[model samples]
Target: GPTKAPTKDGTSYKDLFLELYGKIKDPKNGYFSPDEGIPYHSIETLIVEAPDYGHVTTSEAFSYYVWLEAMYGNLTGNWSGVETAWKVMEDWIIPDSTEQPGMSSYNPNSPATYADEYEDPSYYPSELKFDTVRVGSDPVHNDLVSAYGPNMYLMHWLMDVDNWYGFGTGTRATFINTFQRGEQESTWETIPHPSIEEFKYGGPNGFLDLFTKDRSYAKQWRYTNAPDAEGRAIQAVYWANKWAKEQGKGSAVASVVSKAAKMGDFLRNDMFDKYFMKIGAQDKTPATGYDSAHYLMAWYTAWGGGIGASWAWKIGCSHAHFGYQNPFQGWVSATQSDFAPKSSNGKRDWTTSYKRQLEFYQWLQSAEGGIAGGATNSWNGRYEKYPAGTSTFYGMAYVPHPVYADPGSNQWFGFQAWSMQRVMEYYLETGDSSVKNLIKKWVDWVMSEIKLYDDGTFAIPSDLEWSGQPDTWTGTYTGNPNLHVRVTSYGTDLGVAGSLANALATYAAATERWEGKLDTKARDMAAELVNRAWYNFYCSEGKGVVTEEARADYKRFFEQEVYVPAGWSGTMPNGDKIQPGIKFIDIRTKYRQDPYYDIVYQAYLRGEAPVLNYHRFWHEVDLAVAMGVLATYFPDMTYKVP
Candidate 1:
């Protein structure tokens, strides 16, 4: 039934991929909803992490789904799967004209009123100030309008897939948001609310007062764009276009690839400063035109407006984490004529972004190979006093943890793998000598840390520790011996391992392609890693790979206090009380109904940790894609899958 030949172990990559893809698409497997065919974040309903609930999905997950389909299209000659995935994303996630009204009345001169963001959730709701802050003019809004009408082409960050909050029975996939307070605000400290301000949850004024302080509140709809996810989707589309063209079926995915180009056009919003102020120092001077553009993917770009009124607002973040950079997508958008943006300055801006992102990685790379956190245009998120002698990246101050601080943004080794994977892909495509050297050092460091066990299991760098700072960038490629990193610990995170494996394989392939021969050592190690991961983590019952992760973070459900303003009282959609001094579980009493709640709560009662074999959608997809990658690149390699 498969066209590709099997590896030495008698199992073909096509067959392995088809099996995994069937399980993911099958409704019986619980990956997708029974009625609407929408993907869930996880198979279980009790898990809590970035998304507080398992049923709730994110733009990140949707992008991974797009990637999964692209891989499927590559393995098979059919390109329709890519189109189908993009259609689902468009119909369900992207807001239509009715959802986002009055765009014609938006004013570029004054995009949005300024609001200060505090470091701690306790310091919210940050008062929205108008006269106190000066916001720069939007330079590309008119150009975008001229190119592609007034409708925005961006995906909202979060979606409640199961309607667990009961926004409405008729509403199947409701757009919602969390993590609005500041950098220190982790998922455990967030209050979930609907995008449409209906006063349906929280206090009389709804969750608006809990986040942003205003003289008066209006019923409105707002959405946040995670630029990394958008970039990932575009990267997937790039592969799909290339693969389909190789098979002479380019027209099948032409429409979706054009749409991805448009999405990249709107993604420019993520490249600007938050208040449109000068990027380097703590100055109040307003920026004009391209001066506001940092050309780096910031944490988020947000837009909102009054429901029935003719007013809207838009703002970008000032923080840019190194893990979020996607040079592959930047290169595709900048150089590929078929995927180029239609805006007047879109291609040039993305071209600048492409080079800037590569330089960013070089500037932040530590002596031990791990990239440092990121740089911030807004020191302390409010243009406060900067610490003396801090490192700067083009005028932005270097932050050890750019966005979230609960566990430190750069502390997790997964960021290294995720970010480096994109860099490796870019290197494979262009065979750039600079990128090759960078990847060689990083891969050498990473491979040294990987340990393969006798039982077919493995361990990789889990937590990382960083020290020192890079020298201020001087517009050239120099070394950063002052910056350093150390691997603090190791763990078996399959998703991250999949990414690392893909990066390793791509590096090996690139070496062979450009250097005229394979690097035998890198190729052997990549094959071994992929073989072990496929055999060790596979679960026949679940039809996917899974690892038992301890729920140590679940203690926060009862231990962490969720900050609600004093004297404020409200109720969740399910009648859970929301008042000051309540625990995270207090407002989310629905978690108690989860089947795993008893197991977790009992573990907490006994001061022990509860372990769960979570089938996270992203993890499964990544692992599956890794298998396909090995098959595509190293089909002759030996395998030991049962």
Candidate 2:
């Protein structure tokens, strides 16, 4: 079949191009491009003002933050606004630190930690050592580990140290960390953290002492000057360049690095050495007691990556398992799980348990590409199992995101995507092809499993489930959703999945797995979903995306919907039945499901932790830069099921 050009006469290729270009616009109004080029600067200004833009949806805030990041980078050429973005990012990982800004109730409406109130009364850094709210003097919880935190931390740490990749990666960390500790005690400086005295990755209780040397401690620094770690290598080279630039100017020589990099490195390394032991961390990795898995995973990611960590699972025996987790408590662990939990050197066997373990690995790797998942379950991973009131219901003992079971949780589904991408890059760097075909299967499964539609629409299965929570065990699919008053999440399933598809496609070809439509249905779906979410929704408000207007409405749904009883089958917050045809369902916590909740309060279901506290998932647009859909969608869950 020959594809002809779309003409103004309806046959020219230009006509097709114009038609597509016409469809991309603000959802508020059916406008795109020449009609009104996005007010990029205005959006940037908005980001500069509020920074978090918490009032908007996750997709909206995320995409907008992406723009803000790009504009900020364009302006300063460093991670100039990252200090702000990082704090916001940290808040998302640890909700207790949320600013709540002008709100009257925020679980307490506490002041911010990393922002305007760096030294505030109520702040919770991931590395808290305070004896009160945390375990011991140095808190140890891998749950605090974040894909954004370690990735961004190491990248920027190197960026401030060397001249890698023309000065990207660590740009933002340099500006803020330096400024915070530099001349002004209030503002952060990348190098010489003033009030803090020594460099800690996330600050105070942070693990800066392990990675390098300082008068403060004698721990070996984990940071390496390796020029071959891909993105990190570029980061290091850039930091070196910064050092050279500062030295060349004869400006106080090495202050910022002396402040942030060297010291930050030392603290990070020392933290790893102290907390990664298996004595205290149980189940997945306990939060209290004498433990160190948190710092270990961080160091693994920061140094080379978790690949080496994943290999450590083999050391335990011939049990098919991933890394450590779920053995201690219901918590999670970074270096605790035995890969071969079935049989060990002592002939101990837990075949069935280990089978579930391997299946879990396959589930995560199959969907997101076969990269090693972080640890067992924490952060983006799962905490419990699938849905209820249906045949697939599992009890409280079940953990979420069980890929081996139905309705898989997509926590590290994104993390797996990230890790697999990293693995591909690492393989290329070292010429290792042992996992090549496995990589292909992983890529193809991820690319196709997320098929939004047979044509240019959504393509998820019925009966299948995606937990609604992000950091929680559930996911963002919105299962057969319906939009109500508070504004439920709507997935541009086509666009987000397509963006992931395209990214995975690149990895596939790099590993020689590039056949069978790696990018198939991706671009078409992106175009269609963007048009529907923005244009179709604009045409009929939010009803179009969530209503009968969805052409492929016959499919089964699994993700959570913020609206009424429609989306997934679940009991309401109270024992009351969730009425059908209802405009919406409050995302409140249910009494049966969450004993910690007050039925009337909105605390039933947790709202998003605000993307502003993040490094701005949007800033990593390179992740989905090729993923062109609408300028808006659910930013936090932007790349989730959608």
Candidate 3:
């Protein structure tokens, strides 16, 4: 029943692993979801039912593809799983044909989608199946019609992360210009809007439209229409600039500079300061809550890492528009002058997403060590502050649900893992003592809350939305006074836990921080965290677990044989010839020790990646990186995979 790793039966870590995994994999079920623990079976229905469209290029589709590619890349350490993902990725590229069934207009002019027109009440944004009004309240300007909702532009982010290390084959630099913020930089100049009503295309006018009669796959009900838009949008700029540089030879570099210049100016002027910047702390408002901080932090982190200082200087700052851009305007920006490109800047400036956001996070971090979900009074502060030493119960939210409530609103250690990793990078890059001090404090907080059991598994407190909100509050794995409320631990938590350990472990490897600051405890703890992550997410079955002799036999089996569906013709699109040829030849017998390796092949067979609504690429890859890092840092504590 224990969900943690290495049941305390005194078995060697490897032996316990074998027992646990073998027990989990069914003779029939393929790679299965957990039966007893938090990731309940109920959510599987939601994942199964969640609809997706053909030729969909939105981040929703492409992000998943990116994650899939990474997951495969990490697992096989080669190209086995890579082929499957591009099947979809090829469709997402720009200049894609609209003749496909689920195809929506990708041209910049038709953001919402190509459904209908002005005053033609029969207009539809989705596949002509339903009108835009089938889903929910359209609060802003009602005139908008979009096939893809807000976060749809996330495909751009897929491009960014994919090419971060310069590996992607075909990136479209031409995609950078003329699109709006969510799409791309239209210009460096201030595109003004006196009121939310004036940004006609950006509004969600409440129009009652649906084609119930056909009940076919007409239009998508843009759920929470514009969620994660700016975050995903801003993420693309850092890479778009990089992509421009790649496409730019020499004179072409001018074009790159032009594009980069506009993007930089646009960020500092149009987006930064104008809407979210705080001239002073007194300027803080409810509007610049958690999501805004979360996303802008993401923007700054990626930009700092990607562009560095010189590129940033090239893209200088300008004044913000006079006022805000509807709700997003409240995301809080600093004065344009504050983040102006300079010949030089310090760690906290570029490293920490400039200063205001830093100051905001400093204030937001509780006295003991916790950050609220939101920044000011409205969202996080709405619920009373956490008494200093006590946990803020997931820093606000652990599990994400749509309702967008307060208290227990949203917390993600998975996200924190990435953020903390970036923080460490900042420390390593600048040797900023403050960064180290802050990270230690944060890690100490995490260590305090982390609940490890004798069975070698760990649990953190279950967070919720307003612990007592309506029918929402219920029993969680670690909630107090355990009521009936129940929630599953996130699969991403596995990736995060391992990632957290990897970050600290590697940092320790590089400096005395591992020995002098946290002691060997940091390194050992890193091992356990990675161990737990492997067990929780990857060990639903022990497809990879085996005796040394058995492992050899299995390796021989793959090496000698190849697998192809009996009906497969081994032909690829564009009349290319292909076949399922492993030609395994040992396939790095040690790879079986890595759970991600098995996770790839098994997940492929089980149709398991889409098993949950939020089961994402990071949920797998972060742990993959963590496992690799930990192994690299402390070979002895390899969790018995050798």
Candidate 4:
């Protein structure tokens, strides 16, 4: 008279994954548009950060969507979801002929006109000086063109899901961009401009004059690619291919996986120094042929052209952040025949990138095990002279805060979790001892900082502080004792916590084979963290997990003045004036209509901080996928009842 062993009062990892997945795909949840079927950046519409609006989406979001679907395929042995996600990404996120028109007219010799970057947004509109500063030639232009034809296969970074600015009609996606001035520009200091420049918004010459000063500005189209997002998409595809093959359904995803290879072929654009300058030289010396290539993923690779004029321009960035390097993508492109690029030099370039990316992590590793900011080919983003005694990595100057200066790009611990997740994935695939060693130190440091409470609550490193500099690279792996990092603050940032869970689980899985024994300490911590996150952050009403974020930065909407030239003025589509002495929220004037805007505005006005729970697409997927990761590696993983 027993009852089948009492049913174990707990939830399996697969159950947790499917629960979140269903919520994400539920039409009632408002995560995706009802008509367009595109994912929103967040469920709410009043928030502002990287995307400036909650309803808008980014290539980052699309890439995460691809990754989430890939995890689902891995769990279910059904590859159709992965293909569907990729098709959605390709159809909407990537630019087509209509979006990017004159690619055939691009010239490799003079890829883009020269423009010097400034540290402050006030220093713009930067004068575009043609023929004054020498620019390097693009070495792989002809090969790429021959392989993929004239159109670009890259993903445009941002999109307006609801067309909030009226750039397009009827709830369809509209491409847009911000953060154009320089590295010092933050999201709060940006002017959102449509990708298809038609004098629809901003000053008389459109948003172009806001960033670049020119005698005559033409109607044009421009797009910027965040290499991390592209690299992540390829990484997801690599896993989907491997998982599908494991299930004997490899042919089901063959067509979509091939498209990912094509995307990787174009992603090589991210390897060149901005303006094709010499990699290590802090001067205006143009690089020749392949000398321009740095073999590491830079911050961005942008392309644009005049709408009517038969001309196009493309340029790479000079900066490469440690958090943005994805050795997994490099490995897949270089070693896997299924994921190899079709271009002549593609495989060779990725092979070099794979090795260089690993070295980049080693070069930036602090004595305390946290990686520092990054290195730059162009010092101060203008090829300026470096300070005496500055550290160097392969001739690139070491920057403690690589691309952005406002908040210090490397201040967030999330970068450590995100980047090391890729390294752990690579180690799992290859069992490379070098990668294993790197993760050993990094995971140890990270695990020491995590705090787990008995009542299903936890905290991880939030804000980070760094001092000193790494030792200059000399071709061999040596420890950097001079550089150091400290955990300045701690918080329950569930998204980053989920990513850390992934890294830890991956490390445990990899080291189990390398050391010939399971790392029980790492494995238990990862499992418990997942369980705590599910119990503490899950929103029963919203059907997904969320963390209540104190939005102190909301004051910036009214307090932070957006830089506008004194004499320039224009009107937004909604008839809001874009002129000098305007606050960040002045030009948009649409936030006043959002449901949560009134409460946030009232709190800021009353000198009280506003707190709201946000259901971001990326956060939900990261947590869901972490559950799948643990389930895949440790199938017995279960969510314990509190």
Clashes of each: 1, 104, 23, 0
CA lDDT, candidate 1, residue 146 = 91
Over 1-642, each residue of candidate 4 has an lDDT whose tens digit, in order, gives 001111134778888888889889889999887777788899988888778898888888888998998899888877788878888888888998877788889999999988989889899999987848879999988888888888889889899987897676666679989898887788899888889998866677888889888878999999999988888898999989888999999998899889989888888899999899888888988988877788888889999998988789999998989999999988999989998789898998899888899989988888889989998988877898888999898788989887898789999999999899999899989998877667888988998899988765788999999898889998755778889999999987877888899989988998787778888888888887777777778786745887788888898988999888778888777888888898988987988888888888899989988988888898888888889999899998777843
Clashing pairs in 4: none
Lowest summed-lDDT stretch of 10 residues in model 1? Answer: 1-10
Candidate structures ordered by lDDT, highest first: 4, 1, 3, 2
Model 4: residue 351 alpha-carbon error in angstroms: 0.2
Give candidate 4's error at residue 268 in angstroms.
Answer: 0.9
lDDT of 2 at 331: 10
lDDT for predicted candidate 3 compared with the true structure: 0.30
Off by over 4 Å in 1: 1-8
**Local distance difference test, per candidate?**
0.84, 0.25, 0.30, 0.86
RMSD in order of candidates: 2.8, 19.2, 18.1, 3.2
Model 1 global lDDT (CA atoms, 0 to 1)? 0.84
Show model 2 residue runs off by greater than 4 Å: 1-291, 294-419, 422-438, 447-495, 512-624, 627-642
The digit string of per-residue lDDT tens for model 1 on 1-642 reads 011212357666566777778878777789876766667888888888779999988889889999999999999887878988888899878888888877777788898888888879989989988867788888878889899987789999889997897664565779989898898888889888899887867788988989999998888889998988999999999999999999999999999999999999999889988878777757666788878888999999899788867788888889999999999999999999988899999999999998999999988988778889999998888886678998898889898888899979899998888888899889889988877667878888888889988766678898988889998998754668888899888887878888888888888888878887887787767666666666777775745777777778888888999888898788888898889888989988878889989988998999988888888888888777877787788776546642
Worst 10 residues of 4 by lDDT: 1-10
Clashes of 3: 23
